[PDB]
């Protein structure tokens, strides 16, 4: 979702001129319109807490009750009070402060070869609870462009068309 | 009408012996692919109408069978095709789950080529429709699952020939 | 035709044809001179009856021809008018057969399976035949327009 339809060129201008911090840049990307259209509108209140804990706080959900406990902040205060409460936890301010971009904290053990399945792959933008509603549809009766003739087009094994662009090579000498 | 387990039990029973290591060796091979066949039969059930619409438009829809005179001209005759192609995509799904093509010749193949000759249905265009239908089925279920579902399509095409 | 199903009716009942059946085969063949004149009018008016038929069809259903419609582009629109030429032809058969038996087993039996399987809106093709009906009945007198229109609306009924 890094498209120039989703770039925030005025948040970027206020970060270059030292007006906002990175904590305000990270807040402005969650409250942005591309994040509400592509992510918030295809999750329920429980899976969206799992997305914003994994991407803002940098760690995984502890259990299924941490999802329940935080999803009522979105339903009663809206999305703007939920990201103020998340950014003002001491878990955030001890790790990233207001000047560091978040990251997935302690994903891989120092001597091992594998990791812990990075969080953009563990939770994509929608899941099983919205799969039976917005899952595209291979072959959808859309009436797209037609191909017209097919046995001439990629000829059968005995056809003489295969040795045509070879007839020029034989040529006259 | 036997699946892979029924065929394994029959051959092991027809000699009156128990299920030795070789009989269970194939049964374990069938249970390993049990997860693949259901998901293959899952998506085929979903895109049944879409697969048949793709096959006819890719094989015989653009040919002259549909002309006044071709074998598929009238709307009753055209409607019989997609009804007819539905069985091939459906019974092939059953063979893909059962892992044994016994159901095809039991319920599809016998009296089939002898029936199309009676009606005058072109067996040549029929097999190419199933071949094109086999080609789109490998699109959905993947490569190896398409290899499994494709293994029963040409079984129909072979016997129907 | 009226001759073939008045037979197969009395055929099934193990009997011959009644006066009610034979005074209508009689009444139909004396009607045969007037039927060929009516079908002769629609025969060499297919250029206008079809092209003006698809005239009102697109003005009333621009979705089917707009980008995304089933009959979009130079290709499908040609086939979009091809089917109207088919159904206009079957109405000429029904007028000469004195029944929709030719239209029944051609273009009507299982028609919803075809058009549903082609992605075509079956309601849209029904709108096309209605537009052809107003052009056809505008080409004939009142005594004839009660027939030529009469076979179209049967096709309208079975096509939905």
């Amino acid at each position: 979702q890094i498209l120039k339809s989703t770039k925030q060129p005025f948040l970027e201008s206020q970060l270059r001129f030292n007006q906002i911090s990175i904590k305000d840049f990270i807040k402005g990307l969650v409250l942005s319109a591309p994040f509400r259209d592509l992510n918030y509108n295809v999750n329920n209140n429980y899976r969206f807490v799992e997305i914003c804990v994994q991407r803002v706080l940098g760690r995984d959900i502890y259990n299924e009750r941490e999802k329940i406990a935080w999803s009522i902040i979105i339903a009663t205060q809206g999305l703007e009070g939920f990201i103020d409460t998340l950014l003002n936890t001491q878990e955030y301010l001890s790790n990233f402060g207001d000047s560091i971009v978040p990251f997935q904290r302690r994903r891989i053990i120092p001597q091992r070869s594998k990791g812990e399945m990075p969080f953009n792959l563990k939770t994509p933008r929608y899941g099983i609870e919205f799969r039976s509603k917005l899952a595209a549809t291979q072959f959808s009766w859309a009436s797209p462009i037609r191909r017209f003739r097919p046995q001439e087009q990629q000829p059968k094994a005995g056809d003489p068309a295969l040795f045509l662009n070879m007839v020029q090579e034989m040529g006259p000498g | 009408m036997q699946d892979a387990i029924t065929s394994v039990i029959n051959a092991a029973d027809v000699q009156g012996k128990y299920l030795d290591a070789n009989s269970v060796e194939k049964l374990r091979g069938y249970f390993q692919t049990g997860e693949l066949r259901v998901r293959a039969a899952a998506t085929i059930a979903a895109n049944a109408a879409t697969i048949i619409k793709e096959a006819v438009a890719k094989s015989l829809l653009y040919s002259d069978i549909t002309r006044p005179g071709g074998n598929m001209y009238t709307t009753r005759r055209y409607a019989a095709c997609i009804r007819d192609l539905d069985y091939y995509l459906r019974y092939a799904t059953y063979g893909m789950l059962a892992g044994d093509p016994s159901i095809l010749d039991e319920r599809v193949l016998n009296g089939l080529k002898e029936t199309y000759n009676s009606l005058g249905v072109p067996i040549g265009a029929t097999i190419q429709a199933i071949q094109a239908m086999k080609e789109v089925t490998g699109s959905l279920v993947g490569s190896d699952a398409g290899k499994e579902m494709g293994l029963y399509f040409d079984y129909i095409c072979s016997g129907l020939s | 035709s009226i001759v073939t199903k008045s037979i197969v009716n009395a055929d099934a009942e193990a009997r011959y044809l009644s006066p009610g059946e034979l005074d209508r085969i009689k009444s139909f063949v004396l009607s045969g001179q007037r039927r060929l004149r009516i079908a002769q009018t629609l025969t060499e008016n297919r250029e206008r009856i079809v092209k003006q038929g698809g005239q009102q069809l697109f003005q009333r259903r621009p979705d089917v021809v707009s980008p995304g419609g089933n009959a979009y582009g130079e290709e499908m629109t040609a086939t979009c008018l091809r089917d109207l030429d088919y159904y206009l032809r079957l109405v000429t058969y029904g007028i000469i057969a004195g029944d929709v038996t030719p239209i029944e087993e051609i273009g009507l039996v299982g028609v919803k399976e075809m058009y549903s399987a082609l992605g075509t809106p079956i309601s849209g093709v029904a709108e096309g035949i209605r537009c052809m009906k107003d052009v056809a009945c505008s080409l004939l007198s009142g005594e004839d327009a009660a027939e030529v229109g009469f076979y179209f609306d049967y096709t309208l009924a079975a096509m939905q």
Partner: peptide, 22 residues
């Protein structure tokens, strides 16, 4: 056997044969 029915001879049709260029 009906108002539309098939006979082999009236079939003028490259579909029993399959030269796909027609």
């Amino acid at each position: 056997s009906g108002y539309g029915d098939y006979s082999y001879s009236t079939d003028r049709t490259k579909g029993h044969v399959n030269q796909y260029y027609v």
